Amino acid sequence: MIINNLKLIREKKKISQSELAALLEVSRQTINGIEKNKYNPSLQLALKIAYYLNCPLEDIFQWQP
Amino acid sequence: MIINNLKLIREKKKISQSELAALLEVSRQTINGIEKNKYNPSLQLALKIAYYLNCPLEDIFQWQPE
Numbered sequence: 001m002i003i004n005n006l007k008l009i010r011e012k013k014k015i016s017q018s019e020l021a022a023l024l025e026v027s028r029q030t031i032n033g034i035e036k037n038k039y040n041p042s043l044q045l046a047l048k049i050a051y052y053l054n055c056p057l058e059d060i061f062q063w064q065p
Numbered sequence: 066m067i068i069n070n071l072k073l074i075r076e077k078k079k080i081s082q083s084e085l086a087a088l089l090e091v092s093r094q095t096i097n098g099i100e101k102n103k104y105n106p107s108l109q110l111a112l113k114i115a116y117y118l119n120c121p122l123e124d125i126f127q128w129q130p131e
Contacts, residue, residue, distance in 0.1 A: 002109060043108045044067055047128035057122045063112035 003062040007035040009053055023052045066129045072100040074118055074125060089113050 010020060017035070021028040024045065034041055034049075040061075041049065050057040075085055075096075082100075086093045091110065099106055105126070106114070115122035 002112065040108050043105045043111045043126060044128060046108050046111075047067065047123070047126065050123075051128060051130060058112070058115065061108060061112060063109060063116055065113075065116070 001063060002037075002040065003064070004035070004037050004060070005062070006031075006049065006060050009055060009060055010035070013053065015053070020049070020052060024048055066131070067105050068127045068129060069099060069102070069105075070125055070127075071096075071114065074120065075100075078118070085114075085117075088117055 010017070017028050017031050021031045024031070026045070030041075033039055040046075046057055046061060050060060053060065075082070082093045082096045086096050089096075089110065095106075095110075098104060105111075111122060111126055115125060118125065
């Protein structure tokens with residue numbers, strides 16, 4: 001695998017990691033860990049990220065065989 | 066809460082559960098459990114499903130905003 005564009009997209013929108021974390025009701029450390037590709041979110045958290053960034057999920061998380 | 070449309074999309078495309086399981090390298094039980102709402106797939110499995118069903122992931126898995 002998964003290519004991960006979360007930091008680029010979040011930054012393009014001038015949304016800080018703290019606001020996004022607050023919207024999602026997760027720790028800022030968890031958003032940072034996802035952005036740094038340390039671990040994957042659940043599907044529901046991924047969908048909530050896409051919802052709050054106003055983009056298709058696949059713009060953020062890309063799987064390729 | 067996620068609502069999914071996997072059964073209807075799969076069936077419209079004339080794909081059986083075993084067929085989809087084979088493509089995705091998961092069990093039929095897994096596919097069936099998603100369709101029966103026993104649980105949500107992982108992010109990776111959801112991305113694979115979207116990749117091969119050739120439609121945006123949110124056509125298949127819809128978070129109900131809350």
